[model samples]
Target: TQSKPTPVKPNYALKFTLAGHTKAVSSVKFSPNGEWLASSSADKLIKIWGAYDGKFEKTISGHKLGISDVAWSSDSNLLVSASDDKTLKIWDVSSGKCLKTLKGHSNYVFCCNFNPQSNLIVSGSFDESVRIWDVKTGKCLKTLPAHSDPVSAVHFNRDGSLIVSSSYDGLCRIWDTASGQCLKTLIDNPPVSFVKFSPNGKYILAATLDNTLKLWDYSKGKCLKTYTGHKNEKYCIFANFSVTGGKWIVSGSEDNLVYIWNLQTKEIVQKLQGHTDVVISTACHPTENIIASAALENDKTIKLWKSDC
Candidate 1:
């Protein structure tokens, strides 16, 4: 008799839940230093918690409308948030004070991020532009007419030399950070939701609204592979990669499950289920195996998961 082939999917138990957001939790992100976890929501609030102990630290309130996205600085001392209020605000992490309010986007600011290696900020907007900002001066440095539709997500590569942006136009573009030139345009169908460079800066992962995720080789300017299982036919699904050798791809789905993929085998290795509604955002710890996910209004909670790393 032949031995049974072993299963690869790991069932990680729900470690803990942080129920703070009053409305839909839009996004959850881990700080670069792995000391804090920040969650933004439709309730017009940002909550900070201790990464390891799950202790609620502070609640940041400033935005009049729902915060659409959140990002942390390299030193973990500053955080930036994008809001439907048509502005981006920088916060001092320790003091919980609004440091700067950047006003330029003519429409809702969808996403924003701090370059881990620099003082520049890259933000996306419904205005159909990707703008690079001078963090110190709160001035827009270079504006790239990035896409034909609303720019949903934007991020910087590992070294901050390149920027990745995805749009509802079904395109992902790579831009040169300094020259503001479009390095490459990757065309995909059905409207892409988000795109980001891998930890090593060699691969790009793009999640589409058509319920598919494609991994591309940025250097060669071609898509390398595609993964599927989660449903995203209507909502903007969020995707993340673990820092552990880039071994897994995790994403939140409209199917109300957190899907974790084995990148090496191209398999759905885990499906975290518990939320009462669709999961909209997820984050993997920078130096640990811990994972955090957020559900929409039905739950408005963020759950943490770990596999005993």
Candidate 2:
């Protein structure tokens, strides 16, 4: 019998570098429908760009302080932004109008995401709470005292039945969106900086300040796999599955690189280089083999990468 080593697969290469944000780029997201990409910044602005060409579309500027995160609606017509102003805003993407302001957090809003239905918004805040807002009334429907420390990230599962929130308190809590009840808690020694449910909603991809990303079998309360080799102890950097098929896990590192690992093999497929500062956030294009990466103040840019495979 002959044993053969798997061949190396070519992954991502730089596509374009977008420069406009005056401060650190906090988050980047590709619209679910695949038409647009949005990047939020510490400059108190959210900029829209053409997902395919990297062309600047427009800026949504209403937040009084730095914007920490941005999320797109299921249909690609709406956008939600979390900001240091302690409020979350729903924007009419085409008109660039602030449709509604949902305010309840007593401190900075660190992260937010629109449920698949696009009618509910879940936000995590520095106030140590996770709040769910009703889109139609701009009302905060429920507030879960999610953690003892600042909540770093929040996201809804695919069908919108559950919400997951990570915090600096070293825990990630999953909540029933309807009842606002804490259902399960996943924890580690270090703070869980970012987290999101797998597309199938069976597991979670969590980034811990210990410089590792773990795939958790949430229902069973066990970690299935762990990926390392990236620096992430200082920032609340996000790591997520590749949208292409969820076959790869991609993450931004404090070491100023983007790392991608094969989901099944647990092998690093690539380390994208280009940024000079802490790479804080990343977004995988919905329909294409493209990934957008954003970095800290010293960089203040977003680089789009296209996969060679």
Candidate 3:
């Protein structure tokens, strides 16, 4: 009585070679409007490019060590980057100028993101705590210490009311955005690499180094389903609601494959294989059926693929 979901096949139409990074590209992100692309590399440089023609736009340099992660502000006017230099910096993308450098973490600041409707920024560090800061005044708002190991990933829900963090301690914890109180903990045997809220904010998806992906209900704190397919450890996973009336979940693994799965049915819709080394990072297009991924390899590159479902 139930109809089967159509399988999706993604065609790699364009492979853009971002050649400026002298070392492995660590992260790749598309602007909110999808008109621009940005990448950071182990070479300690961040480059912005025109997404359409793959032309280099501007380069940002300052970090003395490898860049860890880069995130764009909600308005796409600002970019925040964390590095092994133990500093988090805010940049004005239009002028390509460094605005402020926030210093507090004793170790590397691994991941960071801005709240959707506020000027607050949340960052996770190898120091084993998450810090919230005010972007305009450059002041630390609150600090939440819940992880025993390095926090690898951090993100705010759509409503900016909750914060989720994944750590090397094999746990994912959700916290209150305002009071910095720990709310729920999702734990597994092996450490989690990434955690993200579903588009609707009703579920949380986490990818673990144990080669498993889990979806959890936010309200109930119960795991709804477990998805296993990859043979190697997963580095990143993200989920989104499609315009075609289904949920799309994508993951990048050390096996050099990016797998897209249907959340409702737990079926593998597509497997994108091309990265010669570990596929470390991935981002879904905000609106279109497009994806961008970066790899850590000798000849590092970012690949763009379009889904032709």
Query: For all the candidates, what are their Cα RMSDs to the real structure?
Result: 3.4, 2.9, 2.9
Q: Candidate 3 residues 1-309, lDDT tens each? A: 998866543443445655667777777777887778888878888889876567889999888888878888878899888889988889899998888898888898888888887588889999999999899987788988869998988989987999999988988899999899998887536887778787778888877777787888867878887777865454543333444324667766677777777777778777787777777777776766667777785657777776654
Clashes per prediction? 0, 0, 0
The whole-model C-alpha lDDT of candidate 3 against the native structure comes to 0.78
Error of 2 at 16 (Å): 0.6
1-309 per-residue lDDT for model 2 (tens digits): 997544354468898999999999999999888878899999999999988889999998999999999998898999999999999999999999999999899999999999999899999999999999999899999999889999999999888999999998999889999999999987636988999999778998988888989999988999899999889888999887885644788999988999998887788889999999999999888777899999999999999999745
lDDT of each: 0.88, 0.90, 0.78
Candidate 3 residue pairs that clash: none
Residue range 1-309, candidate 1, lDDT tens digits: 977534355556787899878999999999988888999999989999988767899999899899989899999988899999989999987898898888889999988899977599999999999999988888889989999999989989888999999999988999999999999988727788988888778989999988898899977877777789899876666799865433788999998899988877788888998898999999988897788999999999999888643
Candidate 3: Cα lDDT at 51: 68
Task: Judge candidate 3 at residue 302 and give its lDDT.
Answer: 74
Winner by TM-score between candidate 3 and candidate 1: 1
Best by lDDT: 2
| Range of the 10 consecutive residues with the lowest summed lDDT in candidate 2 | 3-12
Best by TM-score: 2
Instruction: Indicate whether candidate 1 or candidate 2 has the larger TM-score.
Output: 2
Q: Of the candidates numbered 2 and 3, which has the greater TM-score value? A: 2
Error of 2 at 55 (Å): 0.6
Global CA lDDT computed for model 2? 0.90
**TM-score rank order:** 2, 1, 3
